[PDB]
Structure formats: C-alpha cells, structure tokens
Design a protein around this nucleic acid. Structure first.
Lengths: 137, 137
DNA sequence: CGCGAACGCG
DNA sequence: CGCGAACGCG
C-alpha cells in the first residue's frame, strides 16, 4: 500500500546534547503527537544507547497493547542495533555508566527472549520534517 | 637536514594477499635492498599484525646492533600501533590465530618494557616508488 | 562535540 | 577481498 508515511504509528526519539552525557527519550503518537511514554533524564549515556532503549521500550509498549502500529526512528544505528539484537556501544563500563549499561543489557535480553512483528521504520527527516518525538533543538 | 629519503635505513614490509590469511614479513637495507631478517609465512594473521611485528622486529634488530638507522614502513596503521604500543587488531582470538596473537602480545610487551630512539618513518609510495621490502605483487 | 555506521596496501 | 585509520543527529 504505497502511502509514504504511516501516520498511525509510534515515533520514538532521544534527547541529548553533550555526548556521552545526560540522555532521555520518549515515544509519541506520530499523527497526534501525544506522548505515550517518556524516560526522565539519565545522567550518563550516549545518544545511540538512549535511542536503542527508546525503540525497545516502544516494542514492549506496543506488545503489551497487542497493537500493530509500526515504530519510526531517525537513527540508522539504533535501528540496526535493534535488528541485530546487539547494541554495539563504545561507552566505557564503570560506576557512572552502570545504569545505562544495565538498561541496555536488559533491553538486549528482552529482544533475544521475545517475539515481535512491529515494523521498525526509518524516518526520513530530509523529506518529512523533524521526527515528532524530537526534543531536540 | 632536509634530504627527502634517508637511504641508510631499514625498510620493513609484510606479504599477504587473502586477509586474514597467510602472512610473512621482512626487513631490508633500504639503499642496498639486502634482506637483514625475514619471517617465514604464518598460516593465519592479518596484514596489519604482520606489519606491526615487522616494525617491532626491526626495532629489536637495530637495538641489538646499537644502530641509529631509522625504519621505514608504508603502513599508517602499523606505525600508529607501534607508537601507541597497542596493536588494535580485530582478529578473533581462537586456536588458529593463537600464534599470531602470541607474537603480537609479546611484541607489545617488548615495546612497553624497552627504550628506543629509532625513528619510525612513513614511506611515501606515491613519490618514492614501492617500498624496497615489498613482496608484493 | 561525541556517537556509531559506512583510502593504501598486499 | 579484508584490514584498520580516518554522514545524521541532538
């Protein structure tokens, strides 16, 4: 069904700046923009770990709800990480990063222990504007 | 002393092709081309590990001999690895790669346990022709 | 600015 | 061919 954007979907995005640094994420209804989940800032993470977590949160939220809506992300790498079931982060493992790493590790565990059919789709910023979940400037 | 090439030097190079695969290296007098050391093929290694080993061999040979000749390599990465005292190879550690990894590990150990002043210089192929130590096509 | 995906040489 | 160095996004 050749319609560009699937509006009945979930858009997820990460909020950063200084990287590694504080990270937060959320999931919004693409069509309506309403926020369907959000994670308060985590003092130390990376953009890509935050976005990885946002997509796996998204999967788990939709799964809970039985819903067939796809998820959109503008991140080539977080999408790849989810599809690979492996978050290939370079972030050091130490006391300050323990929390983000625990969440990422558990997110990976989730992926490798559950089935899902949610399409994870690349949001095309250069044609469709900012992702609705953008924090972000 | 602005003379382009230092002919009274040692040129080192690796022989490959299929990578990872069989690797060998040698050290030659740059001016004369005479081979001053050579390592018989190692069934499994990488180009960059082979060249790393060639440079550290070169350092140890010259050091033995008290000699002030520099060493030339055409490899940006092996030169960086030696200068960093860390061979950042992606080669898997398994039974078939154990030997090359043992040699690399011991080469690193050498570097971090000995002093040397041998300049390690980048051979400029695009201006000075093939490195004399080239196997290599 | 960093995070990560994506030329020479043999 | 692989080995390794060296754009979008927030």
């Amino acid at each position: 069904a050749k319609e560009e954007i699937i509006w009945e979907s979930l858009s997820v995005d990460v909020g950063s700046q200084g990287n590694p640094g504080i990270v937060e994420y959320k999931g919004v209804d693409t069509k309506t923009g309403e926020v369907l989940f959000e994670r308060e800032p985590i003092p130390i993470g990376t953009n890509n770990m935050g976005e990885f977590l946002a997509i796996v949160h998204g999967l788990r939220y939709l799964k809970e709800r039985n819903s067939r809506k796809p998820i959109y992300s503008n991140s080539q790498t977080a999408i790849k990480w989810v599809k690979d079931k492996k978050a290939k982060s370079t972030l050091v493992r130490n006391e300050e990063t323990a929390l983000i790493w625990k969440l990422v590790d558990e997110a990976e565990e989730w992926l490798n222990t559950h089935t899902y059919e949610t399409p994870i789709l690349k949001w095309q910023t250069d044609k469709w504007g900012e992702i609705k979940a953008d924090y972000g400037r």
